[PDB]
Amino acid sequence: ERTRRAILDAAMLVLADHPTAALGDIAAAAGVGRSTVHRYYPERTDLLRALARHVHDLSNAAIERADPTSGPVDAALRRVVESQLDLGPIVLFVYYEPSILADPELAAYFDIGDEAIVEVLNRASYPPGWARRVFWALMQAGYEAAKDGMPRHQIVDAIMTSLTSGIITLP
Amino acid sequence: GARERTRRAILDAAMLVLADHPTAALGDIAAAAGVGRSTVHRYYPERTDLLRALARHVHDLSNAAIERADPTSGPVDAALRRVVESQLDLGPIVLFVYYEPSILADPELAAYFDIGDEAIVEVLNRASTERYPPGWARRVFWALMQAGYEAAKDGMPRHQIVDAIMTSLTSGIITL
Numbered sequence: 001e002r003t004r005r006a007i008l009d010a011a012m013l014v015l016a017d018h019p020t021a022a023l024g025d026i027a028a029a030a031g032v033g034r035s036t037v038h039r040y041y042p043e044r045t046d047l048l049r050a051l052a053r054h055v056h057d058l059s060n061a062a063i064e065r066a067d068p069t070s071g072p073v074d075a076a077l078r079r080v081v082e083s084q085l086d087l088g089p090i091v092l093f094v095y096y097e098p099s100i101l102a103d104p105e106l107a108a109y110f111d112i113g114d115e116a117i118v119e120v121l122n123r124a125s126y127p128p129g130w131a132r133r134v135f136w137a138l139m140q141a142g143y144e145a146a147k148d149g150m151p152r153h154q155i156v157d158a159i160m161t162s163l164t165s166g167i168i169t170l171p
Numbered sequence: 172g173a174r175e176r177t178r179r180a181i182l183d184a185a186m187l188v189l190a191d192h193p194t195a196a197l198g199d200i201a202a203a204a205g206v207g208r209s210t211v212h213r214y215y216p217e218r219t220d221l222l223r224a225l226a227r228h229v230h231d232l233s234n235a236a237i238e239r240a241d242p243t244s245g246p247v248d249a250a251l252r253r254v255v256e257s258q259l260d261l262g263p264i265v266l267f268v269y270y271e272p273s274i275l276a277d278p279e280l281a282a283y284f285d286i287g288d289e290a291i292v293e294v295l296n297r298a299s300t301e302r303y304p305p306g307w308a309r310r311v312f313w314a315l316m317q318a319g320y321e322a323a324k325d326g327m328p329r330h331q332i333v334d335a336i337m338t339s340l341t342s343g344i345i346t347l
């Protein structure tokens with residue numbers, strides 16, 4: 001379990017910045033040899049799908065830790081947003097690398113975990129499930145802004161304002 | 172000519188096939204284009220070459236579509252709606268190519284995507300009575316567009332997606 005964790009953390013750290021990195025680069029960052037990675041993940045796709053699952057699990061833990069239904073909605077959503085942003089740009093990688101969510105099993109797993117965020121967005125309230133889509137869309141813009149080196153506070157403010165007001169105001 | 176037509180056939184086949192089968196082999200795309208694997212390799216020697224070409228082509232379509240929407244004609248709300256429609260109509264292949272410069276670590280493709288990418292921002296800013304960090308509006312627009320492509324794969328009707336994107340841009344989703 002420790003070695004598996006070292007490998008997946010190294011994959012997160014490395015692929016977030018260098019999405020085409022060799023398995024050698026990932027092994028080195030984990031403090032292990034290539035054969036080690038191979039023993040757990042025979043093919044790159046194996047590693048990438050394990051990585052995705054691990055990232056989703058960390059995302060779900062951060063949601064539970066943020067405790068979205070506890071206390072005032074504004075402060076609660078900010079806790080959620082801050083801790084999702086702390087995952088970093090690996091999230092963009094996992095959602096956009098074509099071979100990852102192409103697996104139907106993993107795609108189904110990915111649909112599970114954000115029910116409490118949806119509750120809170122519902123409480124503070126559009127086609128079916130649109131609000132949920134918009135929230136994660138704003139999160140996506142947030143990850144890209146973080147990628148540009150924008151400070152977490154300003155991203156969180158931009159997301160919260162976008163949730164309540166959108167980005168333009170029509171005459 | 173023949174080569175131009177063949178190139179367009181391969182790209183058009185890639186746009187359809189990869190939107191539903193993101194891991195499809197180059198040979199599978201060849202078959203969908205009605206050409207031999209041998210022929211496809213004279214156009215794109217490796218799959219990754221086709222992926223970069225497709226991404227260029229889609230960015231091209233995106234630019235032509237914004238132009239075709241006459242983004243500055245008439246009431247700004249109706250104009251913005253035309254722009255949204257124009258991009259929604261590109262289809263779910265946009266989900267495949269959006270983050271591709273990053274995915275492929277291809278700064279050249281990133282530079283390609285840059286060209287024309289301020290027009291949407293001009294359209295948004297000139298439809299707004301107020302004044303967010305650099306690039307925020309652009310990124311939100313495209314994130315919402317992709318929520319749109321996803322909703323569309325999930326059976327949401329075009330007109331309803333356009334209404335939702337428009338409402339999200341101009342008013343958000345919650346009240347605190």
Ligand SMILES: Nc1ccc2cc3ccc(N)cc3nc2c1
Nearest residue numbers: 059060110111112113114136137
């Ligand atoms: N673009 C999207 C769409 C739906 C999503 C659903 C999620 C559920 C749980 C979780 N931890 C993260 C999620 N991220 C999503 C991102």
